[PDB]
A paper describes a structure:
The ‘TELSAM’ variant of the human translocation ETS leukaemia (TEL) protein sterile alpha motif (SAM) domain is a 75-amino-acid (9 kDa) polymer-forming crystallization chaperone that is soluble at pH > 8. TELSAM reduces the entropic cost of crystal nucleation and growth by pre-freezing some degrees of freedom in the crystal lattice. Additionally, pre-ordering many thousands of copies of the target protein along the polymer results in substantial avidity to strengthen the subsequent target protein–target protein interactions that are formed when adjacent TELSAM polymers associate.
The interface of vWa with the vWa domain of an adjacent polymer buries 188 Å2 of solvent-accessible surface area. Specifically, the side chain of Gln138 in the vWa domain interacts with the side chain of Asn114 in the adjacent vWa domain. Additionally, the side chains of Glu111 and Asn107 in the vWa domain interact with the side chains of Pro144 and Thr140 in the adjacent vWa domain. The vWa domain also contacts a second vWa domain, burying 144 Å2 of solvent-accessible surface area. Prior to cooling, this crystal was briefly (∼10 s) exposed to iodine vapour to label exposed tyrosine side chains. We were also able to resolve the main-chain atoms of two of the histidine residues in the 10×His tag. In the constructs reported here, retaining the 10×His tag during crystallization clearly did not block crystal formation and may have improved the crystal order by limiting the possible binding modes of the target protein to its host TELSAM polymer.
Residue numbers in the entry: 10 to 185, 189 to 267
Write the structure that this text describes.
C-alpha cells in the first residue's frame, strides 16, 4: 500500500536518510500539508537520529507542525519497506587466514548498517566444504550470535565457492523480497571451480538474486566480475567506508 504519496527521493527507509534528506522531507511536508514555514535546521541530524526522538521532541522543535511531522514520519515508516534477504558467502580458506578479520569486520559493519526491519541476514562460510553459520533471520539476537561464531572461525582449506553459493541459492529458493548475495573472497579458484562458481552464480540470478563480490587481499577482479552481476557490483574490502557505503546504496537501490 501507499496511503502517503511520498516522493521518490524520500521513499528510502528513514534510517538511511541523511541530514539533507531530513531537510528535504521538511520542505516536502511543508507544502504537501500546507504547514507553516519550517526552518531547515529544526532537525539538524540524519534520519537515524530523527527516529530516536520523541513526539514531545517534535512538539518542542516545531510548535506549529511537530505533532504532524511525527505522525507523518510514522506513516512513512509503515510504508517504506526493506524486504532484503542478505546472504554473506564468506571465504574461510587457508589462503585468507591472515585476512579473516577483514572479512569479519566488513560483514559485522554491514550487519550494523543493515539493521532496518524486514531485512534478514544469513552467514555462509566455505572452504573445502560449505557451512551455514547463520540461517536467514531478522532476529538481531541470532544475528549478534552469528557474528560471534564468525569471529571464532579458524580459516583453513581450499576455495570451493560454488559450495557456498549453493547454500545461498537453496535458501533463496526455499524462501521464495530482494535476495542479495555478498561473496567475500580473493577469487583465486583452482581447477574447474571457476566454471563451477560462475555456473552457480547464473542460478542465483536465475532465482532473482543480485550477486555482489567483495575482494580481499590481491583478488582477481576478473574472476569476481564474472561471479558478480557486473563490474559495478565488485568492491574492495580495503575501500573502507566508501565501499561499505557503495554496496549498501547499491543494494538499497536494487529494490
Amino acid at each position: 500500500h501507499h496511503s502517503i504519496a511520498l516522493p521518490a527521493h524520500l521513499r528510502l527507509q528513514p534510517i538511511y536518510w541523511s541530514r539533507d534528506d531530513v531537510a528535504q522531507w521538511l520542505k516536502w511536508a511543508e507544502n504537501e500539508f500546507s504547514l507553516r514555514p519550517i526552518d531547515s535546521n529544526t532537525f539538524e541530524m540524519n534520519g537515524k537520529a530523527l527516529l530516536l526522538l520523541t513526539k514531545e521532541d517534535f512538539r518542542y522543535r516545531s510548535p506549529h507542525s511537530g505533532d504532524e511531522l511525527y505522525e507523518l514520519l510514522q506513516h512513512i515508516l509503515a510504508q517504506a519497506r526493506a524486504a532484503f534477504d542478505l546472504y554473506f558467502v564468506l571465504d574461510k580458506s587457508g589462503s585468507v587466514a591472515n585476512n579473516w578479520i577483514e572479512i569479519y569486520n566488513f560483514v559485522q559493519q554491514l550487519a550494523e548498517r543493515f539493521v532496518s526491519p524486514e531485512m534478514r541476514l544469513s552467514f555462509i562460510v566455505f572452504s573445502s566444504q560449505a557451512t551455514i553459520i547463520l540461517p536467514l533471520t531478522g532476529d538481531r539476537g541470532k544475528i549478534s550470535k552469528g557474528l560471534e561464531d564468525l569471529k571464532r572461525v579458524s580459516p583453513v582449506g581450499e576455495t570451493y565457492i560454488h559450495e557456498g553459493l549453493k547454500l545461498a541459492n537453496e535458501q533463496i529458493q526455499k524462501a521464495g523480497t530482494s535476495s542479495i548475495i555478498i561473496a567475500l573472497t580473493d577469487g583465486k579458484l583452482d581447477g574447474l571451480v571457476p566454471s563451477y562458481a560462475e555456473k552457480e552464480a547464473k542460478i542465483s540470478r536465475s532465482l532473482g538474486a543480485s550477486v555482489y563480490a567483495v575482494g580481499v587481499l590481491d583478488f582477481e577482479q576478473a574472476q569476481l566480475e564474472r561471479i558478480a552481476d557486473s563490474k559495478e557490483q565488485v568492491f574492495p574490502v580495503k575501500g573502507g567506508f566508501q565501499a561499505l557505503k557503495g554496496i549498501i546504496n547499491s543494494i538499497l537501490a536494487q529494490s
